[model samples]
Target: ETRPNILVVLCDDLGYADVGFNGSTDILTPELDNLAQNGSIFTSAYVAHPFSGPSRSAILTGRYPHLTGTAYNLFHNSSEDDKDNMGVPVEETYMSKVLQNAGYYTSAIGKWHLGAAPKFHPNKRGFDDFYGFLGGGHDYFPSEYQKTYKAQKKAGNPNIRDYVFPMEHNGKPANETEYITDGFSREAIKNIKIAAAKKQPFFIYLAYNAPHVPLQAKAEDVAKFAHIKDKDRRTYAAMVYAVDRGVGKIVQTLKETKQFDNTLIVFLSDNGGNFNHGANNYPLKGTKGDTWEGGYRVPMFFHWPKKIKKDQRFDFPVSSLDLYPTFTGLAEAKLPKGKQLDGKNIMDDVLKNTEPYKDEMIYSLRYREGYNDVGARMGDWKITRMGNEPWRLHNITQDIGEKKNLAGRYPDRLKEMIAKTQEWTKSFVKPLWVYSVKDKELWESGQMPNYEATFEVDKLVDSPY
Candidate 1:
């Protein structure tokens, strides 16, 4: 069998009702719809967190974001110390690093906000080629002013004056004033062609920063969704169309190169909808900040002509963290050592009847409080609670929307769930450690800055801080 190329395409802050297959008639996502029709769609897929930073961290590391020191978004405005906040620890091994060491060319295109320091960049993390911004957001149209601004690092009421607009290609800045999204696609296609020419297996992590805030879309793509009723939603829909079209371009390129069959394509979003940004997470319970079904639950589809049949839909609840172990198993690569991988071999259980899927899973969101502050799931049963509060139970299968809380009726079930959730949380990052304050400045400035001093290894003081 030929080694398969992997394409992992992720969207920023995409909602549940945005995809066509998910009963959305207002906006068209034909590329994703086609993928769903041909590939396997995991109807109920989730992430560890409900936002971009922590959620994407879990997906990449196959561990909770808190474990990697990215417990909350960059914009957690509760701390004054910026260095401790908004950083992904350098110790944990990433998927790309493992893949690259196994002789696969690894590349990451778009939105690498893992860490602010160069030591923790995408290139440093494991990607051989990286073409995107180092921070969280960027201006679609590259103006001199927009290109120089930094993204807001903390979560709170954002000021329009603080929007970011930097463009980076690989490790260096892209010196051209091009549209960021278009530039990302162009760089991605270039890599695809290069990989095809060399006949080398490649892994492309295309993390699109679209359909997020400061919605940006081309005039033609904007025209396609001009009929949308709300002005704000029109722009959001337009960005979605542009991203969908970009996906189509990649699919077409694979076909043109005759590499479609040997390639594995996966599509998913980092988190749930942002109503303030004109995203619709309807038919689900809450938006991106909340850990309800809507927050962690997003649309996910897998396509691998070599292993999976087309037009298949699985009702099983899946997770983005499962990708790390699943891909490693599929590629027959050695697993990383000295670390406990929270993700399971989902592909083994998914493709073959050999292994069984794990019965319970848990999710925690240290980002917000009013919403599900922490939660856990066991089969169809789920238990969630607000900050340091009582646990509420719900049968997610029946209440997919999570409208009803059955804590009053299912006291024993809630107690069991609390025990399980507590156990899981303890196995992973201790809740106290994750919920600990890193910086008061992160609570103040979204662009939380880090301060450090150079030192020789042996010249260290008793206490570094």
Candidate 2:
């Protein structure tokens, strides 16, 4: 009981109000909703980025994506020259490494978007066992994907979509028979059983790539959601249900293995829902790649039987960054002398139902093709900027939808808030790599990431501070 087994079950591209606990009426997530109902649900939970790779980097590294030079997703399909030269920098220690050092058996079970290089593999990143694809995403049906994978290999296709590539465990190709989601959940149970026998605290990073894209759901699962007429939403609902079933199975496996009581289950999406796909971010403006609430705000719930208070809702802002320090502190793990952390341990704060950082500002920035979209939240006030648009201020706590822009009414306050958030830009380093060749060309030309234009408060004020 000293070091609770940490199980982070993260969804891919899940939207706001997608789960029943979060106000989803049609697309259901009974298992997640049940855990959320009994667990501590952070109503204002946000991630480091609006996209996947950078957010996962921030989640693991406890640093902002810009700080870690991971402001972009690690893509494989791109023909960029710097492709192989990049990864989440090896120097920054991972939370899994800390936990692994503390004797927790660590395993990453799915959707490893951080990096694909051998140096950046999950096993190299401190996970003791790794069972998943080392790419951004994967196709769900192994049987269907296997044909494509073999054909690509036989046809001498130089660059294959990582989706159809074989899933591996500890660098060895796995003979995965079950559907991808089912296989991941099955592997999770096996890991739990192995960890149970070994009698060591465990940490499982169950990153499901379901409901993201290439929307493929079992006929049985899809049939359950047939009532939803929109084919996209219907398929998505089934994909979500598939994940829920796996979650229920994992929870049951925990109970059966006698680890349920001591396990700390964390559930959230890497980022916001991709609206272009079969996902919904209802009430929140914008989609997955936007700087809007629909992009970064996600469903985050933590469950630990007996230890966690039932039905407690944390309203203050928290992000994936918080998990690193929170988990490390809970496990009594140590970081290097100067490990830069962007998060505070909120374990105590959550237990007490107190604000973790009332005065602290939570910030997010996403680089578009050539411009920057940024948002900063401090207490109830939030400042947002998209490209060359004037910075807008909103009382985000009261205006979660960001419907009312108070830049005119609260000019001084907006300026002050903008100034404060602008000051944060000073700490940002250059992006390590970019998403495309055009971005690289623009980046090389010094035309992108125009930070000076983002925080215009600096023009009128003595300092952004």
Candidate 3:
């Protein structure tokens, strides 16, 4: 069998109901809708963690975040001594390495939250080419003032703002003038053309850092959504629209290069939207950091013109962890020796309409300040335990909103699920690092952080900050 080119697009902090395919009326996402129309939409897709770092760790490594010791964000509190304990272990292999070994050219574009150390860099791990920043978040626009800041970094400045994290193409610093989303898209298009010319199967990981923070968008794009009442939401919609336009450009490039039919594309958000940042996860229970459906559940779609049928909707629960096995399965790559993967190969399940994952249990976990927030899903029965609270049970199929708690009614079922969760907990190792101060406070207070405080809302709302 011929290997299909793989393209995975990941969005940062996108809401559940923020896409056109997921029934968002305020946000315009025609390009994302087009991809969903051409393939399958997963109604109950989830990530392993609610935050960016741990969530991305699971997707790339195909293992639980706790097992990998990346259960929380990578924070450099005082010194560089903890650098060794911040990212995925060097011994572990990522999906890109598997494909690259199998004769597939791999490239990564946009936000790399894995680690800032040289060992955990994208080029060191697997990707042949990397064009992006290595941080949790960054400023969207490139300003001339950054030139002086870069100089200061070279002159031994350690107090530089995290928002001005350096952008790089491979190893060299990149001064990008276009919007961050557009710059990433342009690089991807160039890479697609190069791969197509080589006639080699390619794997492109396009991780867009949009709708995440700073709430910056091209004035033209923001102007399009002026009908939106709330200022922050209107800017958020514009950010999402910019990504949609990038998707449209990527699809057009594939078709123009005659690689559309033989390519497999996957698109999803890293996790649910943050309610504090004008993100809307409507009809879902909680925001990005909780164990509720809104926290882990995200909009996901798969597209492959030659291999899979189009216009299909799958309601079965699935985890983003499946991507590693699914991509490796398509490439005919072998799994690492003696290592157990947490994700299942859902390609056959989705294409054949089978239930391989129906009875199999899936788990999500987040840890902070001695608190373990966990959730487990087995078919329609879902159980969630918020910080120090009792485990609440619900048949998610009947109650998507999680309005009713059925724990008292189903004692046996609840006991069975709790046992499974305890068994799963045995596999987790001690976390490498703790959550950031801001994230810790949010978890403790049970409230979302105010992300807009640092940005000049009044000055930047109409013009650049």
Candidate 4:
């Protein structure tokens, strides 16, 4: 009955340097900044993938997407295919289900990108109560989306896009009118109160899809960024600000419900920012869909007043995959039998400020045409390869931006890293589904993966192009 609550506040496509806590010069996020100031800021935080779906799956399952056959996003346009049952395999025991079975009140609010099929829904995946869209993302405004959704239905559209779809409460549509961010915040507060009344420890997954694409913000919120000259930049700033404000409200609700001190709140983005839009991943290379540090490394902080110290900074590499074991251990829950996890329970390491992943590998892989983009790290060293390019090494501890290649200077280290990387690829299963039909076509034609060349440290091995 006294188990600490777990609150995971995940943002969609939030820029690395977009928040004040992360040294954003222009953007204002006073609420989030305060939380980070009082908590531990993780300087080298990484997710399992460079994008949404896979990253989320890895977070929930505590296993890499490649191992689970979920390396790519779902939603292929192939009708009458196996993709219709797209999602994390039902066999994998998600963290939510582990806690739920262990006597916790679990609720998933907003942005369920995992799957939309009946069996793949959030409720089936371990959440007792699921609110918000079952798809990847949604439009911010209800009036605009409702109008478009109605028109599309009238026009005999069979496959309506998830963006404009209405919010679903327990697999049923609800009449929601608030801004999407505000609505999710309200729903979260309600759930907190519900759990409090039932005297149960709560596990909340507050996944907010803000500052992403289709840049649109309230006029008053956007007006706060008068100094931002670029239209997209101003809108993006407002969208981030909205999430910050909602976080403030959620924090207040926790205090009111007497769960503030006992709740372990972890905040971070699902993936890197979208630079083509209005995101800013300063001092890091590449954008959201790459294998660079900027692609997977994110701004992460943990605020647990009762357990964690304030103003602490963790510089050692920490992956999102670690959260599963860490949270389950904290909840005193039992992991599923025969469950395989790629990450460790790092709660003790965080408390002790020791290296939890010393000499261990943290890999990020994304499937591309004819090859795969890969980034692997062990301690301070990093090995990177974009598509079919030669492997490049960097002393990431010294060069956080991943600049100044050290491949030539450290030949032996590069070879060792690549060899280990080659071994990691051996366990990877083919993707269960992809984002597009083109990717499926390439996979069939043997123009994808090409892992031997992807793991090559020396000469090029038969380019597909």
Best by TM-score: 4
In angstroms, how far off is 30's CA in candidate 4? 0.9
For model 4, residues 382-420, the per-residue Cα lDDT tens digits are: 999885677789999889888888988998999999999
lDDT per prediction? 0.72, 0.87, 0.84, 0.88
Model 2 bad stretches (over 4 Å): 77-83, 457-465
TM-score (all chains, Cα) for each model: 0.85, 0.96, 0.91, 0.96
Number of clashes in every candidate structure? 19, 0, 0, 1
Model 1 alpha-carbon miss at residue 120, Å: 0.7
Residue 357 in candidate 1 has what lDDT? 40
Candidate 4: worst 10 consecutive residues by lDDT? 76-85
Candidate 1 per-residue lDDT, tens place, 264-317, comes to: 898888988887787888788777877677787888888887777887777776
| Candidate 3 structure quality by residue, lDDT tens digits, 141-196 | 87733675678789898778666766899989877778889999999999999898
lDDT (tens digit, per residue) of candidate 2 on 1-465: 478999999988998867778878889789988899888998899998998999999999999998989999877653323347567888999999999999999989988877777778899899999998877888899899999999999999988898898999998998799889999999999999989999999999999998789888999998888678999988989998999999999999999998998899999999888887888898788889788888999989999996997888989888789999999998999897789999989988898878887888888989987778988888898888865577788998788888898887888988887777777878988877788998899889998877777677535334556
Task: Supply the TM-score for candidate 2.
Answer: 0.96
Question: What is the alpha-carbon lDDT for the whole of candidate 4?
Answer: 0.88
Best by lDDT: 4
Name the weakest run of 10 consecutive residues (lDDT summed) in model 1. Answer: 449-458
Q: What is model 4's C-alpha RMSD?
A: 2.3
